[PDB]
Amino acid sequence: MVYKITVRVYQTNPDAFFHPVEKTVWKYANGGTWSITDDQHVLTMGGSGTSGTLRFHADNGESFTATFGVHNYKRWCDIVTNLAADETGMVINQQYYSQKNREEARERQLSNYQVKNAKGRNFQIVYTEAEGNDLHANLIIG
Amino acid sequence: MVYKITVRVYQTNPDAFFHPVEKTVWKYANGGTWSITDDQHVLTMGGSGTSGTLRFHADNGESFTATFGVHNYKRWCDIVTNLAADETGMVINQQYYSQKNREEARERQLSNYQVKNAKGRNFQIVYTEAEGNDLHANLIIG
């Protein structure tokens, strides 16, 4: 059955402004689509076992990836900060199915995750609808 | 050596409606960003030698990828209409730097390319500004 993850982005700090610069979809479970409905990023997936990655960028150099997916019928999420120049969104998205620490993050099936970058800025994902096929999550930027 | 490719999408046939469902950026040349300015898709790249893939999807089931980038200081593009169910945009984008047939398609440095899918719908990419670091291309859907 189709899984959908609707993401709302909350920027709370005026000292920086992030905007999406990359939207990727993993190939498993017949892939999926990244779309927009009323300023909401909607990830529609063909089933459980795949994911999608949003990469954001602020004009001050700061950047992070926010990956949302469904592993064994349960939602998961992870945030990667301090990205290298050759660490684009498609690079990160694939790592959750090849790189050990990333695979463990997905297998944790978190309804919420929190991490900071080197500058101290906090990034959080919180699933407000954390069960079923219609998932909703807030992306909160500190 | 920063390159920018501005893409304008033209849909000419009311029997279908396509919309972007994936925007990827290849990791080479310090990667880059996919952005939006006045309904135009803007691919900014840190240098020559990388690319970005836009995957489009119609509600009838039709899909294709339009990849734009710079190879050897000249613009290039390619359209893939025979998307496998496990071939998302990030899959296609990487193949231009791993699969020989896609490598050759990139190294041809096309500023103009036309191709159809199995249903007979035509897809076209034309660079109206095919010179310099500020490149401009039309994506015309038949």
Numbering used by the authors:
A (entry chain A), B (entry chain B): 0 to 141
What did the paper state?
Sclerotium rolfsii lectin (SRL) is a cell wall-associated developmental–stage specific lectin secreted from the soil–born pathogenic fungus. SRL displays a clear specificity for TF and its substituted glycan structures. In the current study we report two recombinant variants SSR1 and SSR2, generated by the deliberate changes of the amino acids incorporated at particular sites of SRL by the synthetic gene construct method based on the complete amino acid sequence of SRL. Interestingly, SSR1 and SSR2 the two different variants of SRL, differ in their glycan specificity.
In case of SSR2 amino acids at the 1st, 14th, 34th, 113th and 123rd were replaced with Val, Asp, Ser, Gln and Gln, respectively. The crystal structures of SSR1 and SSR2 lectins in their free form were determined at 1.7 Å and 1.6 Å resolution, respectively. Like SRL there are two protein molecules (named mol A and mol B) in the crystallographic asymmetric unit of both variants related by a non-crystallographic two-fold symmetry. The mutations of SSR1 (N14D, E113Q, E123Q) and SSR2 (T1V, N14D, T34S, E113Q, E123Q) were all identified and all atoms of the mutated residues were well defined within the electron density map. A bound MPD molecule was found in both variants at the same place like in SRL while in the SSR2 structure two additional molecules form the crystallization medium were found bound (MPD and a 2-amino-2-hydroxymethyl-propane-1,3 diol). In the structure of SSR2 the mutated residues Val1 and Ser34 are located in strands S1 and S2, respectively. In the SSR2 structure the T1V mutation leads to a shift of the residue by 0.6–1.0 Å (depending on the atoms) while the T34S mutation does not cause any conformational change on this residue. The adoption of this conformation of Asn81 in SSR1 is made possible by a shift of the entire loop encompassing residues 81–86 by 3.0 Å on average, from their positions in the SRL structure. This shift is less profound in the SSR2 structure (1.0 Å on average) and does not lead to a change in the conformation of the side chain of Asn81 which maintains a similar conformation to that of the SRL structure. The carbohydrate binding property of SSR2 remains unaltered compared to SRL.
